[PDB]
Design a protein around this ligand. Structure first.
Ligand SMILES: *c1c([C@@H]2Oc3cc(OC)cc(O)c3C(=O)[C@H]2O)cc(O)c(O)c1O
Ligand SMILES: *c1c([C@@H]2Oc3cc(OC)cc(O)c3C(=O)[C@H]2O)cc(O)c(O)c1O
Lengths: 299, 282
């Protein structure tokens, strides 16, 4: 079987705290003696549209920030700002601090989200960074500060922090540097996600996973050039397939003996005919939230 | 906004996962208090997969024939016994990471989270449901025998499933934590197959309600719906009471869907219980 799997969230659960400034409360990420959270926590109801974060932060003292790790209150001894993330220095290092690093992911890459409310983890799920730099996540009010991550070798790579929900229902956030994915800004002025597309390299990887698990009904005797595939796939609103993407599919092609452009011909036919009542790995749609690395890891 | 197949945070279960080795077999074990639980098939050999005598195989083994690895530490086994299809290994050290837990047995149509582990090392977590045919459509890529399923109510972990084997149809079968199998399956490498599976109708209705909350209202009598749907499981009064837009109006929507996408899915998802919708949408 093939499941959309999230990484074990235990190493991240031990880092989620509750940050309060004024009457605003959201989640923070406690690593070493620093707590990371969205800088919009310092905004009031009149600072939602055009806040000057430099002016708002200079008016704050350390005792204006209430950091709460479970039932233990953490004393803030310093505060600074980097891009859209607020850094709260506390007098206690987190003893549960795992091996970690901050990374920025590319569109199409996947990660796991630990949805938290009031610093309390409530659920974990797997998702991908859409080509339009949005997240088709599952967030309610109080989830800002939740983080996305991958685990590579018992080291936690933090790549996402949730900041806001867009009017279309999707979500936008930053890396742990405070830099937003996409052209979005931490302001409550109407923003809209660009035109989203299907992650082509992920669908091909998912098709390779279907062959690995024993499904071959979708293959055909055809091949295609890289340009002719892109000409057809882009008409179905698929992201263009680059030569780097083809190289990434290398190991899966060798493991299955099916050339990438041969699998491209299969995908071109699947888009043309649909499923015809059949399923691939339990899905009736072409799933695009598995990277070629996710396929190899689970298989 | 949004709707995802959300699993419970797995941190409380990760601290319990250990590696159990017996002979040429290595799988996952659940370390709770001073007892490690794992499938009793761990004591089988290569030549004892078709018709093993577990009573005979266990009597011939001593405590030191079981090697339990908890991180970089080897736990010392001081006792071994069997409860149904689960082996219970008594160790000399209580697990300091033992959470508040209880062993429960779930019903078909209920959901839970699985922490898929590989030889004691956790690798991934996902959410799934107990199919009416008592099978699990999970992802178990070997070395995952002994992985457990659970739910979390308040701070209490309700262990409900332990994985034992995969069926020839790609689905998986297991037991509860007391060793009692879900479904008509035995722990032997024999000819067995999963029964005709049916769709959990009450979960589909709950999933349609989650779509109305998320902005999908384009498709917005009991006995009449059942006769058409049964052409899927039947709906009871408790189903409508648990799903308490009237329910019968939603059944007419589902009836108009079975004959003649929703939340990014071309299929009617049936692995979200009515409480899962409330837990995620509130
Ligand atoms: C608020 C939020 C998010 O705050 C927020 C701030 C902002 O600019 C200052 C713009 C937008 O769009 C948003 C949001 O979308 C809000 O979701 C999140 C959370 O969790 C809390 O508690 C809060 O008060
Ligand atoms: C074996 C297994 C599972 O062992 C197993 C035993 C059995 O009867 C004794 C029947 C079947 O069907 C199975 C399986 O399907 C195997 O998956 C699991 C794991 O993880 C290991 O390591 C192992 O040796």
């Amino acid at each position: 079987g093939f499941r959309k799997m999230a990484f074990p969230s235990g190493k991240v659960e031990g880092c989620m705290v509750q940050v309060t400034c004024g009457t605003t409360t959201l989640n923070g990420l406690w690593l070493d003696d620093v707590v990371y959270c969205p800088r919009h926590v310092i905004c009031t109801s009149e600072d939602m549209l055009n806040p000057n974060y430099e002016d708002l932060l200079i008016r704050k003292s350390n005792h204006n920030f209430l950091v709460q790790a479970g039932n233990v209150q953490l004393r803030v001894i310093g505060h600074s700002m980097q891009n859209c993330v607020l850094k709260l220095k506390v007098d206690t290092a987190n003893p549960k601090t795992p091996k970690y690093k901050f990374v920025r992911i590319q569109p199409g890459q996947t990660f796991s989200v630990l949805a938290c409310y009031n610093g309390s983890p409530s659920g974990v799920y797997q998702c991908a960074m859409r080509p339009n730099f949005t997240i088709k996540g599952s967030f309610l009010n109080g989830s800002c500060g939740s983080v996305g991550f991958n685990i590579d070798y018992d080291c936690v790579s933090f790549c996402y922090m949730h900041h806001m929900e867009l009017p279309t229902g999707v979500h936008a956030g930053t890396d742990l540097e405070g830099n937003f994915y996409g052209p979005f800004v931490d302001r409550q002025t109407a923003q809209a996600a660009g035109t989203d597309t299907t992650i082509t390299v992920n669908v091909l990887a998912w098709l390779y996973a279907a062959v690995i698990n024993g499904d071959r009904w979708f293959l055909n005797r055809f091949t295609t050039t890289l340009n002719d595939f892109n000409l057809v796939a882009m008409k179905y609103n698929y992201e263009p397939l680059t030569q780097d993407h083809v190289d990434i599919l290398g190991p899966l092609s060798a493991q299955t003996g099916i050339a990438v452009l041969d699998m491209c011909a299969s995908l071109k036919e699947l888009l043309q005919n649909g499923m015809n009542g059949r399923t691939i790995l339990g899905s009736a749609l072409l799933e695009d939230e598995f990277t070629p690395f996710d396929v190899v890891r689970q298989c």
